[PDB]
Amino acid sequence: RIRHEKEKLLADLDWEIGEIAQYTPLIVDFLVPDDILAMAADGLTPELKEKIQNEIIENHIALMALEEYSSL
Ligand SMILES: [Mg+2]
Numbered sequence: 001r002i003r004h005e006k007e008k009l010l011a012d013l014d015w016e017i018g019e020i021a022q023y024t025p026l027i028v029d030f031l032v033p034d035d036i037l038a039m040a041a042d043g044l045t046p047e048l049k050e051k052i053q054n055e056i057i058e059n060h061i062a063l064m065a066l067e068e069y070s071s072l
Contacts, residue, residue: 006032009040013053031059 006028010020023031036059039052 002034002037003028006037009037009052010056012040012044013049013056027063030063031056033059 003025007020007023009032010023010028011017020028036052036055039048039055044052
């Protein structure tokens with residue numbers, strides 16, 4: 001359920017289902033650590049939505065950067 005609920009959060013935050021489906025479980029875990037999932041616990045979305053989206057984008061930025069240094 002935990003991973004499942006992370007993937008559902010990513011959808012609820014407007015990530016396209018098409019791109020979520022291509023995340024590996026380890027990437028899901030990296031993008032949506034348990035502290036971020038927990039943010040959504042008593043529900044969205046106020047602009048809790050924008051808050052969490054910002055947190056996940058930060059993590060995705062981290063991931064991307066790491067892909068880019070490795071190569072170059
Ligand atoms: Mg965990």
